[PDB]
Design a protein around this ligand. Sequence first.
Ligand SMILES: [Zn+2]
Ligand SMILES: [Zn+2]
Ligand SMILES: [Zn+2]
Ligand SMILES: [Zn+2]
Lengths: 387, 93, 139, 63, 56, 49, 106, 49, 171, 103, 27, 159
Amino acid sequence: PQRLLIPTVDDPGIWGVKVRLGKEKDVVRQILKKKLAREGTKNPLEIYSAFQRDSFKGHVYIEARKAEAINDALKGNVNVFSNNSKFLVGIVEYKDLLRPVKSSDVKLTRGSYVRVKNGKFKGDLAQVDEVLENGLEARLKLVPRLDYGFRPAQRLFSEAEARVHEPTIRRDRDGFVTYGGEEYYEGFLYKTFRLQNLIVNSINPTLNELSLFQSNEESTTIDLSTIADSLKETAKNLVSFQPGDNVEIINGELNHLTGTVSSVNQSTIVSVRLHSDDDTINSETVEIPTSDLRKIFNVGDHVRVIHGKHTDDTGLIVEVNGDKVEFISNQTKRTVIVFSNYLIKSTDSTVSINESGRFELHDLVQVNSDLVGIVIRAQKDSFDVLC
Amino acid sequence: FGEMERDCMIAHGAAGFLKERLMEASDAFRVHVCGICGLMSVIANLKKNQFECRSCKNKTNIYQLHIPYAAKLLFQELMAMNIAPRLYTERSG
Amino acid sequence: LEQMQDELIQQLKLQMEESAIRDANNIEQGKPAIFKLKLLPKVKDILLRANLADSILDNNLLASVRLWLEPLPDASLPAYQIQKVLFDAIKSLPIKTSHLRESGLGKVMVFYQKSKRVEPNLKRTAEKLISDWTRPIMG
Amino acid sequence: LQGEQYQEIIEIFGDGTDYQWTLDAEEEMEQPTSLADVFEPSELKEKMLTDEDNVIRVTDLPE
Amino acid sequence: DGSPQHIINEVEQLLQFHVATYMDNDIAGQPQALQKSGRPVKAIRARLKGKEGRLR
Amino acid sequence: STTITSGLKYSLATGNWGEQKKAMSSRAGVSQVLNRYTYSSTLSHLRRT
Amino acid sequence: RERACMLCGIVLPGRVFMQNGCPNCDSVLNLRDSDQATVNECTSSSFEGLVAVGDNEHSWVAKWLRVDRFQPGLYAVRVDGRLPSDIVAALEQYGVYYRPRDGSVI
Amino acid sequence: GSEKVLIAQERSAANIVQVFKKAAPSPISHVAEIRSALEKGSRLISTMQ
Amino acid sequence: MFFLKDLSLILTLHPSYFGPQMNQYLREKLLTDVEGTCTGQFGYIVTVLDGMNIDVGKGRIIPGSGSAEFEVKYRAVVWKPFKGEVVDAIVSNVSPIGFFADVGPLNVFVSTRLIPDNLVYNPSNSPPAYMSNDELITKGSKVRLKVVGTRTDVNEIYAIGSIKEDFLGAI
Amino acid sequence: TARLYQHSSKSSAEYPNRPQLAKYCIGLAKYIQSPLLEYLALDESMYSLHIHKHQNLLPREKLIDAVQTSIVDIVNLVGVDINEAVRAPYHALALPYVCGLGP
Amino acid sequence: NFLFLRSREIVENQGVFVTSSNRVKTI
Amino acid sequence: SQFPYSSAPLRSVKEVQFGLLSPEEIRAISVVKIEYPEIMDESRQRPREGGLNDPKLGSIDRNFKCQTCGEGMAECPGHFGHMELAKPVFHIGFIPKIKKVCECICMNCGKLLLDETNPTMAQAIRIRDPKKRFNAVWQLCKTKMVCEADAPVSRGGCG
Ligand SMILES: [Zn+2]
Ligand SMILES: [Zn+2]
Ligand SMILES: [Zn+2]
Ligand SMILES: [Zn+2]
């Protein structure tokens, strides 16, 4: 079993000792060697076990029963500091000192789409065709970046252009081509990459790369499970709240209730005052987790886009189609439909156009071959010119 | 123009000369303060002619002041230590 | 004195059970649970009083505490304020094995520990409390 | 441990079946394609992935 | 990741020390925060006091 | 060989009589730049306590 | 170069595992009588939490790590990689249940 | 390249008994002080009161 | 909606105008600088009542700049639209994205998404209009609309109207 | 077309390590090689070219329709190779303007 | 011959208005 | 006249109101959240956004304009950013006052240990100056070493 093995009062104690950084495993090996050497002698090292954890830097934990045993184990070592920096580990901490880590995900799944940390395809989305059993590397499906004779743009490996620019192409199978030492399978590069070269979480996909990857599958973006999970992650993480926001509750006993955010504490507890026909209920403040709150957007409110192609665009709400909200823009003066997850009720725009485009305000520019004008107002997407 | 010279100028009663010495002949600066929160948090863009205090969400009740740059620095350092000095242009009693 | 406190705690127990029943019916009637929130301040004030812990354990109010902590049949968890207040009260009182046997709160504690909609801080506190309550049994 | 106090521990803490069905319902509700939700409608219209697009492509008429 | 209370206490006490010395580096009863050159850190409080401070 | 060399050179160059990393609390002004304005000034500087 | 035997959790050099095999798991793994692929599938060089055990019988840690019936030595709290399905079935044939030490299973 | 001069530093002699009268706001009225220094090296070692 | 409000203005006068005609000059300066302006807080100031008998008080000399500062208090007629208000209008332009109407000095834009569906935009009609079987709204046509949202600018106000509810549309 | 190409991000993606004057010269060379394809590469900025003295008097929709009709007529008078269009998108810019076809 | 005059009094187009150089005099 | 024209009216300070900054106000007046310890992005100019040298905080270079206000170096006053703390910490300047406040109130019910029933307490509350009022209230409530769940009738205490 696993539950029954939890420690008791009569179990051997655990001590932690500060040591010099980077020598923890060395101290562990020295302790084991000393225990083995003195095992079977008149004065054996009266300890039971010793270990360390990578996260808990500078600490080595020994399971024993006596402080003299700890002193004897540490006697004759140079990594131990001058002072006896030893402490008694609390019995409750015994389970935590040996609990595992990095259990967020079971494994890297073959066929999943991931981003590359570094290399020539730094940041390019890649499909995990193969996961090596070692777990340190994995073979991936990528879009080649070649010039055929500062990196070239990603493009499917073209055998005809490659032969024209380099007639030394190799062939090993049908559809599997090796050019310049790189193996391209049906126009897609297949190359092993280390685990330290990949981002397996918070992956941001683009429909352009998705289409370029799924075109060979005879269907545009047939696989959408991992994409749906990424959508859920993006929707959940992008939500940020402020006092005074009108929100609705999705779960809990208070489901389908409206309220206004009164105060914000940390990023997971939000104090909300609820609104209802009963006056005595409207005078109560409730702290509610943010994971069960949805923003309420009323028609005719100034709202600013948080994230997306229309970032920093503002307008007035016109149509509320549930998840997707429609609003008339201020700069383009046209209706734009964006999800309610990307909107914040900002009563004032005050948009700054700096660090965008080539021209600033009051710039005398040439409209065309005949018309010359000056800039009166700048936008995130266009400019206004008086000729 | 140390403190003893300032005391001598006070004794003479010349307030205009003292103000000119410590502002025009030295670090003079212009800031904008919100008429509500009283803090120097107004995001003023002079060329576009728009002023805005995000905390109070107002665009109108905004004034400008002429203060020594060292005073602005002192108030910002006070705000860095969670102390909020609020400057108001009207008395209340 | 102590008997008056026991009577008051029994009245609180009856009020808590009635409020739980009313909130369950209201949820079954398409209305939010409000009675538990209404009774929460008085329950919090009573529980925060340390000298009444002995009378609480005499009257086995932990049974009603578990009843409030028990998720309703609609698979909806109780309000976060109720869970937080009850966890704080459980920490604040010297719960023994006999009291757990009378109330049977260990089942709900294990459910909270295993569940994932529960707040991770509440998850850690539930693990800590379960370990503390298993401590006397094994030694 | 010892059997009788193991039974006592079971009595105090339960086997979980009193709320195993609650846990199963929670996990069922935790688990759940429409391209409208995947990307912004403006981007979809730019990339030509809407119902008007399929109707135009299917239709036997010059655009 | 993982919560040994001793480690948590040590790291949170380090954070408290850094925040405190960022605003006042003359706290009597404990050593001052030092730079890599060995000089004490010029906290914000030291900026405002003395003849060479902000006010004077 | 750098230890003694740098220590002696630093203490003689800056006047702080101690280790470099313990500049505070060390006796300062022990070593000074020789005054060469006139011969008498140099002679006076070389016999100063 | 050191690798952690997945089954028992011991950590020894990979060449030691190849030349001599696991002193504890040889009754069910035959690591010495196994090729490099099987050695990798049962001994992994990617691990965490070096553990030195002196007395298996009385060490509560050894019982907690289920290594109180093995040879004292270098052990790893967490080992990257799991036993293969075929090796899992082979061990289940012997009647021995395999509990992963990867931490993802608990 | 700069000419540095070592300024002689004045200090109280060692190995001599100094008797001092402490001020009134103290339980101590008189103090006998001595600082010790080995002949070889003439370095301060310890002080006694 | 029109209102009467007591407003105040700060007027700075250059020393070159320190003459006997100072008061009247301040009056015309106030009239030129207030009549017709648009402030988001108040709306539109259309006229100032008793424009030739406004008290100006005593001006204070600004130390270090010589110019005098005057505090002028006056009563003026002000118009400001409100959210959720139904007012009369005259259509000024017809466009596929919607039609623009005028409510006094304010120009209101109504999008197609706030127009009843039966009022299909007809570009072939002369002039082009949003017409139904029994309704035809074109340039110069009286319309009754409800203001839903108002946008505040530097010295301008942008309002959005709707005719999708009852007793709205053509009148 | 060269002036507009030296500022277009299409050139930057095509030539990430080249100066702006190099992009301008490349645009000039491509215009000499094939004016029609360069005029197609303008996409939306082609509508801002000085086409007629009173080009701005017409409504935007009418001017856009006139440009579309002219370019469709010219490209249909020219003809488009399907194989080369598949081989290179640059030659495929002319595909949507063929009669019967569309973007 | 075109000059781009800006005045703070004028509100239209942020005070920017185009006026020919032949129709203005130096102040 | 050395400052560029600004349409905001020019006035002079008449009152300085002191106080503390609420976390809500700190979050409101901030323009960016500081989270990355690296000062420089990749040591290739353009300091990392979200770091301690975010361009939104203000500009100190002649050729770089502030990304928040758009003004030059001579006009940008600087804009604040905020950093979220994982665990709350003491303000070093208020620890003695925090200790005094802890001595004045109960640590469980969060209420004063004395009430207006005491004539001395009412007399102390009658005073106007906040500092002297706090001093008197502390001098009284310091001796009271136990919270009362009942009136010295329930006074709101927890006992
Ligand atoms: Zn403000
Ligand atoms: Zn083994
Ligand atoms: Zn700025
Ligand atoms: Zn109390």
